[PDB]
Short mmCIF file of C-alpha atoms in Angstrom, two decimals:
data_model
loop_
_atom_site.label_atom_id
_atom_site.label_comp_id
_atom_site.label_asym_id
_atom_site.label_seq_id
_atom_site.Cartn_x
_atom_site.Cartn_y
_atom_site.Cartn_z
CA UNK A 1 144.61 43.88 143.32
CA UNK A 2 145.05 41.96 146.58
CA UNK A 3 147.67 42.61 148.83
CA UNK A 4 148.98 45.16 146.43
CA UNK A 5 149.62 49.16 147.75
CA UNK A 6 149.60 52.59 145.99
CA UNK A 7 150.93 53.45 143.09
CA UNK A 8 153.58 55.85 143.09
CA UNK A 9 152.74 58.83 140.11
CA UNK A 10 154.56 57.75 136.83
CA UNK A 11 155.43 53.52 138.02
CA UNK A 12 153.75 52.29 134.91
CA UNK A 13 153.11 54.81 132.63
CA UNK A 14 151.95 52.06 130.33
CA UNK A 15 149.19 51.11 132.23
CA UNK A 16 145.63 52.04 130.28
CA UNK A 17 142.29 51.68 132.14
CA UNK A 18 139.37 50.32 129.41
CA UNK A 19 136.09 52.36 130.20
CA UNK A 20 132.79 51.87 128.98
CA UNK A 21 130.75 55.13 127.94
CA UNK A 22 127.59 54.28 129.10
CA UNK A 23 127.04 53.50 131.70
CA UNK A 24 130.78 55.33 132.44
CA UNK A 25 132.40 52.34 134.45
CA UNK A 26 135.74 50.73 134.59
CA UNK A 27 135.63 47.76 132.45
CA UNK A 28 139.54 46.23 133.04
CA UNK A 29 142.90 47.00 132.69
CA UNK A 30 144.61 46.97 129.58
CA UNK A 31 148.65 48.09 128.40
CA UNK A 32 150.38 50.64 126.04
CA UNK A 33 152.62 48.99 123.40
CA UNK A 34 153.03 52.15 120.91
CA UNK A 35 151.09 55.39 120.39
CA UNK A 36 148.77 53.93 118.42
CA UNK A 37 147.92 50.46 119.58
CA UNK A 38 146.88 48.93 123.44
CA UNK A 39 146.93 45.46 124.50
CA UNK A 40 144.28 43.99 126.66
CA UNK A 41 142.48 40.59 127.28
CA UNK A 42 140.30 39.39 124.80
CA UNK A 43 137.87 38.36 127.16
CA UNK A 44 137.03 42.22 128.07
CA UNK A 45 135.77 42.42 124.76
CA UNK A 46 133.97 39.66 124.41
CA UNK A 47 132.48 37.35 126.69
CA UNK A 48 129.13 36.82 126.33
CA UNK A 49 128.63 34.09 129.31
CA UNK A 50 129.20 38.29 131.65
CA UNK A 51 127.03 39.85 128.37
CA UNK A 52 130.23 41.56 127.05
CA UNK A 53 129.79 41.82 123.53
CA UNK A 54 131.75 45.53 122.98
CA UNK A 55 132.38 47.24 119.75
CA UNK A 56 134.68 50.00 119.03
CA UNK A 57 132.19 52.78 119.68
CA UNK A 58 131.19 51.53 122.92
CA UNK A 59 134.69 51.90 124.76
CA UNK A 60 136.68 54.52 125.58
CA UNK A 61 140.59 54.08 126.87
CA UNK A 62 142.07 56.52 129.62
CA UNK A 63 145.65 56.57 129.70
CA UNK A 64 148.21 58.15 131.92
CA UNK A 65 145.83 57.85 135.14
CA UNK A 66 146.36 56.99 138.48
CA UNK A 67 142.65 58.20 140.62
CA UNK A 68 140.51 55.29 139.63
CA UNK A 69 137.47 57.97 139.43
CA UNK A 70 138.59 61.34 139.49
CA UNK A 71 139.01 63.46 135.57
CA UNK A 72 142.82 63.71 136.25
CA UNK A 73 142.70 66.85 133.10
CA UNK A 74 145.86 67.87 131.66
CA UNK A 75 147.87 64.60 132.66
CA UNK A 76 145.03 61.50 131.63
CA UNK A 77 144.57 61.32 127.54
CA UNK A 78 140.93 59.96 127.14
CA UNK A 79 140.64 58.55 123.52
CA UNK A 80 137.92 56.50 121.47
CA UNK A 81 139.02 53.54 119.61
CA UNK A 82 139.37 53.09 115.59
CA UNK A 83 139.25 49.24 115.79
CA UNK A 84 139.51 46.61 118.08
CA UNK A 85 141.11 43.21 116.95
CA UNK A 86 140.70 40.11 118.77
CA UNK A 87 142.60 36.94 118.89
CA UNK A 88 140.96 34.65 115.48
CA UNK A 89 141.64 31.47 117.89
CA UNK A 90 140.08 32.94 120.76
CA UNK A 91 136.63 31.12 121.45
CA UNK A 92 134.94 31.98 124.88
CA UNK A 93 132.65 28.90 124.45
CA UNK A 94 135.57 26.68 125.45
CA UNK A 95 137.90 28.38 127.62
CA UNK A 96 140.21 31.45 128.12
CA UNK A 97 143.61 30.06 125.74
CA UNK A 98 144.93 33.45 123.35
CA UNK A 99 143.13 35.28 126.00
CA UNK A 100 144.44 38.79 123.81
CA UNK A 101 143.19 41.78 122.06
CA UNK A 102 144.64 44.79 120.31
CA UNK A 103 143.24 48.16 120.57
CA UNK A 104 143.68 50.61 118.06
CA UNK A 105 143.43 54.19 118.80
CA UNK A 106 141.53 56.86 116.68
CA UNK A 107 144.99 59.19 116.90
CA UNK A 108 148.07 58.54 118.66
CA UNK A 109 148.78 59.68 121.97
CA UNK A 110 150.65 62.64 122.94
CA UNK A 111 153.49 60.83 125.54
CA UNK A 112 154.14 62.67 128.74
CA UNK A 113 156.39 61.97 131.87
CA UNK A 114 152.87 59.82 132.77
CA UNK A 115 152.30 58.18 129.49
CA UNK A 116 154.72 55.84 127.59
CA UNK A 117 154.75 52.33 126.14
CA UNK A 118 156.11 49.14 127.60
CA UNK A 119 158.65 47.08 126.01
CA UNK A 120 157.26 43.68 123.98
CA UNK A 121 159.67 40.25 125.10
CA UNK A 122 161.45 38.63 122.97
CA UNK A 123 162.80 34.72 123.06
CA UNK A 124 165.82 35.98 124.55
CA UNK A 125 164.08 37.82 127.75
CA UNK A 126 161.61 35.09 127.54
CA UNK A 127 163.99 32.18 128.17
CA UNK A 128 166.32 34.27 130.69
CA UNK A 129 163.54 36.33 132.58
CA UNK A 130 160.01 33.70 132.20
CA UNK A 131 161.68 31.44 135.15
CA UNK A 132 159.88 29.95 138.07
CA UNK A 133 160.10 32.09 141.31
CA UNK A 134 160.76 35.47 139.57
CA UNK A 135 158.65 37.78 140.28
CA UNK A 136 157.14 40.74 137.78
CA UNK A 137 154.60 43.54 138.69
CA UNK A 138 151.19 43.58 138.19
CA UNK A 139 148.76 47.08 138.24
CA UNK A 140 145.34 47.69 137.68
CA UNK A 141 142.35 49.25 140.01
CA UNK A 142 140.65 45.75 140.99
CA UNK A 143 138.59 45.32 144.06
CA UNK A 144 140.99 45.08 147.06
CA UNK A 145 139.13 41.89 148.86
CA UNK A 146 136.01 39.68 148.12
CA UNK A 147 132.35 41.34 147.90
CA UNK A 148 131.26 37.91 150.37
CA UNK A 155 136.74 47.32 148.74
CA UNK A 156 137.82 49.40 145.68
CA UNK A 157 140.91 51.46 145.86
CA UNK A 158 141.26 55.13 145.01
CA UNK A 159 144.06 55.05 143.40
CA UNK A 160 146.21 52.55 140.81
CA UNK A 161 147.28 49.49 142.82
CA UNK A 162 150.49 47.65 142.25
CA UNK A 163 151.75 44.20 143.25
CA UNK A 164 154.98 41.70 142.88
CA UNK A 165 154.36 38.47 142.09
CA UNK A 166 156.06 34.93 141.82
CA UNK A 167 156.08 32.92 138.33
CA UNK A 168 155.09 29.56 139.27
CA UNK A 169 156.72 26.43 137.66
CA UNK A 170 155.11 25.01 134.99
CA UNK A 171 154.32 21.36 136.77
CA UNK A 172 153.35 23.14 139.80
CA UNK A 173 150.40 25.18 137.81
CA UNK A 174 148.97 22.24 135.79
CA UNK A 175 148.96 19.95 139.00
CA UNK A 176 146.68 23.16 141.08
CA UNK A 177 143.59 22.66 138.96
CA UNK A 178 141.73 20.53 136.10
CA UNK A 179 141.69 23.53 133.64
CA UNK A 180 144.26 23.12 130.85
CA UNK A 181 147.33 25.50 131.35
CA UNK A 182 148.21 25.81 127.37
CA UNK A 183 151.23 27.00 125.64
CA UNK A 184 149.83 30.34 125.90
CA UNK A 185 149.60 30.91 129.66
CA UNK A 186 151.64 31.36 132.51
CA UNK A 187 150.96 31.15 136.24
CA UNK A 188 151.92 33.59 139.12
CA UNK A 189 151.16 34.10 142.76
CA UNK A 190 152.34 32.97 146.33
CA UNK A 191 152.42 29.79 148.09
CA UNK A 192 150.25 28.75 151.17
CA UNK A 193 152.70 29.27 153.52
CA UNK A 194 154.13 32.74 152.00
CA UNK A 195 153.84 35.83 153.81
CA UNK A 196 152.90 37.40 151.05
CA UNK A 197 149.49 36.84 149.33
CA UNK A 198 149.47 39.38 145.97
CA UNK A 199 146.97 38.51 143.54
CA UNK A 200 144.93 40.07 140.94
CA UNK A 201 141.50 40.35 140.59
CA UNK A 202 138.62 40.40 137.78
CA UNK A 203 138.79 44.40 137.68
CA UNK A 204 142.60 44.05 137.04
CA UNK A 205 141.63 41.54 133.98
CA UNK A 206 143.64 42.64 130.81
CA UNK A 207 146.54 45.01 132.83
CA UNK A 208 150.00 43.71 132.15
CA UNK A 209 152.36 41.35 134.00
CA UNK A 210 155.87 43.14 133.71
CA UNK A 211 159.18 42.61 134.63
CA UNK A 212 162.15 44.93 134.70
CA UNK A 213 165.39 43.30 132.98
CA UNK A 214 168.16 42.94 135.07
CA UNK A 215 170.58 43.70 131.76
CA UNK A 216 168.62 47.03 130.31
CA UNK A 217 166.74 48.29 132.73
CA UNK A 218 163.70 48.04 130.74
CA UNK A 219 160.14 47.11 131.46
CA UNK A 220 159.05 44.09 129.33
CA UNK A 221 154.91 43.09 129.04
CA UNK A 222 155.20 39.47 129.46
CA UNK A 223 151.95 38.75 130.55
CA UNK A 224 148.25 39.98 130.27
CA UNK A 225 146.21 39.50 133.54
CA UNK A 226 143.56 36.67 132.34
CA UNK A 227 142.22 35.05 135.26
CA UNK A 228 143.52 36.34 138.67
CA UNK A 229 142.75 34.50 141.98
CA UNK A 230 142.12 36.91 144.18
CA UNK A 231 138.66 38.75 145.02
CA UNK A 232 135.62 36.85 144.66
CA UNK A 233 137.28 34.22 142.72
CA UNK A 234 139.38 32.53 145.90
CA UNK A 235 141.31 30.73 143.57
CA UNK A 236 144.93 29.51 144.02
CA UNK A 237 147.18 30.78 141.62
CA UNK A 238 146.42 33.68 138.64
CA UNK A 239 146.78 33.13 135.17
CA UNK A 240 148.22 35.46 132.30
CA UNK A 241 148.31 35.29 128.61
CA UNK A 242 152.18 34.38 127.50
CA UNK A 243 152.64 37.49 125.34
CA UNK A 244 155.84 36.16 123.54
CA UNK A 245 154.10 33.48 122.49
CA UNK A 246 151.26 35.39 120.74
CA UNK A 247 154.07 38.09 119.72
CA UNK A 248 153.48 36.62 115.93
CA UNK A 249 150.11 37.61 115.62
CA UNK A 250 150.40 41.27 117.39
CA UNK A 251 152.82 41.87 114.61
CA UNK A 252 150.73 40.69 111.82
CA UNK A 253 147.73 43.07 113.19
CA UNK A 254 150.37 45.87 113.71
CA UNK A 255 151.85 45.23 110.20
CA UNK A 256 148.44 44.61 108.85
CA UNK A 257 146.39 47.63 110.18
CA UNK A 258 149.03 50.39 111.81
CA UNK B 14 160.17 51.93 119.91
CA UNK B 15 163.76 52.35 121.26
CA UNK B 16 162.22 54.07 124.20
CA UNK B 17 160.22 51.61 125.38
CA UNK B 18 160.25 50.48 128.63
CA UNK B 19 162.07 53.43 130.38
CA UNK B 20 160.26 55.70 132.87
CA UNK B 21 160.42 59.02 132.77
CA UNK B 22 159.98 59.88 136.50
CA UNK B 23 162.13 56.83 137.27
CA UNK B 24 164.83 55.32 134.45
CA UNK B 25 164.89 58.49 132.76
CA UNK B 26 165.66 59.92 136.08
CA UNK B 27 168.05 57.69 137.73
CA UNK B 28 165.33 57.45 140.25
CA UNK B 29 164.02 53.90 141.78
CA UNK B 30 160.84 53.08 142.57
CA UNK B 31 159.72 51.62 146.32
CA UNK B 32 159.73 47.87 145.23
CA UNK B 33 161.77 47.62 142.23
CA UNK B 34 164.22 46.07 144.80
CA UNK B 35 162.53 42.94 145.19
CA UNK B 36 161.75 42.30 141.49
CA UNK B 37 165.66 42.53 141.32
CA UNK B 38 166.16 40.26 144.44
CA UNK B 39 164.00 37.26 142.94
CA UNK B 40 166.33 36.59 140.06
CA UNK B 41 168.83 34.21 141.69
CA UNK B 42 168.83 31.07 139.51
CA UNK B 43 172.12 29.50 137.83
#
């Protein structure tokens, strides 16, 4: 996360950090819907153009942390995974559209004043909350700047939704159905972004009516970092919401 | 299920966090 600052304990209890066993690295950011089941990108899975090509017994999740290295015992729940479901319309070979995946835990987690789950949107927050120039929160432990730099501890960040036209028009990628755009403007004060690291956290918004937290976005290609990109881009969880239920159904 | 979404340092607590404010703030359309 660019631009972003520290974590206060407890912000996003739903925030889940996907680490590899071995080596033991940080692999990306990832959410926690239910005590069972954790939403990520698809492309931390699988993406075979970085030589990801992960199975269920070659990830772990860590949940309820906010050190991006130190064994935070008795507060972080590190669990293996049962299954891991991605997308069936994902396809890497062409381009990042249903950039989702659903994580199922071995057992569910015990939740604690630093672990609980997010709210899922529905059309109604969708249509009254998904607007151009409202901002939602994104967290994850991302580099802090370009290589050509990590932070300690879970970084957070507020950023814009950008209109619709206004994303299509910045590049010659194809902003589909199932994306949304976020980040500042050149001549904003303000220059929040994500970054690869931060690939698969959640974009979340509080509601204004309920005072809940709502996941309606999965970090799938931030801007910030390496990339120098202009705006980020995030999976439109809503509009996958259909087949999240059909796993949950399916497999819970 | 009916919990999600609420913090328990923070919702749960009556308590704000440092930036919650401007999230708040940026939802001035109608």
């Amino acid at each position: 996360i660019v631009e972003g600052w520290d974590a206060e304990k407890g912000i996003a209890p739903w925030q889940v950090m996907l680490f590899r066993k071995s080596p033991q690295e940080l692999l990306c950011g990832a959410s926690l819907i239910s005590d069972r089941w954790v939403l990520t990108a698809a492309h931390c899975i699988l993406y075979p153009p970085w030589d990801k090509n992960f199975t269920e017994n070659d990830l772990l999740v860590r949940i309820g942390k906010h050190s991006r290295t130190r064994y935070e015992r008795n507060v972080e729940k590190i669990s293996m995974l049962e299954k891991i479901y991605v997308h069936p319309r994902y396809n890497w070979r062409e381009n990042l559209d249903r950039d989702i995946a659903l994580l199922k835990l071995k057992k569910p987690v015990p939740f604690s004043d630093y672990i609980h789950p997010v709210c899922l949107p529905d059309k109604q927050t969708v249509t009254s909350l998904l607007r151009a120039g409202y901002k939602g929160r994104v967290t994850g432990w991302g580099n802090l700047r370009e290589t050509w730099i990590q932070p300690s501890v879970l970084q957070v960040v507020n950023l814009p939704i950008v209109e619709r036209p206004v994303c299509k028009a910045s590049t010659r990628i194809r902003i589909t159905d199932n994306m949304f755009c976020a980040g500042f403007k050149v001549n904003d004060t303000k220059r929040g972004d994500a970054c690869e690291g931060d690939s698969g956290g959640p974009f979340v918004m509080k509601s204004p009516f309920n005072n809940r937290w709502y996941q309606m976005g999965i970090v799938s290609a931030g801007a910030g970092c390496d990339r120098k990109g202009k705006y980020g881009f995030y999976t439109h969880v809503f509009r996958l919401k259909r087949w999240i239920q059909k796993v949950i159904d399916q497999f819970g | 299920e009916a919990d999600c979404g609420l913090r328990p340092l923070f919702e749960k607590k009556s308590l704000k966090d440092t930036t919650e404010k401007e999230l708040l703030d940026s939802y001035i359309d109608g």
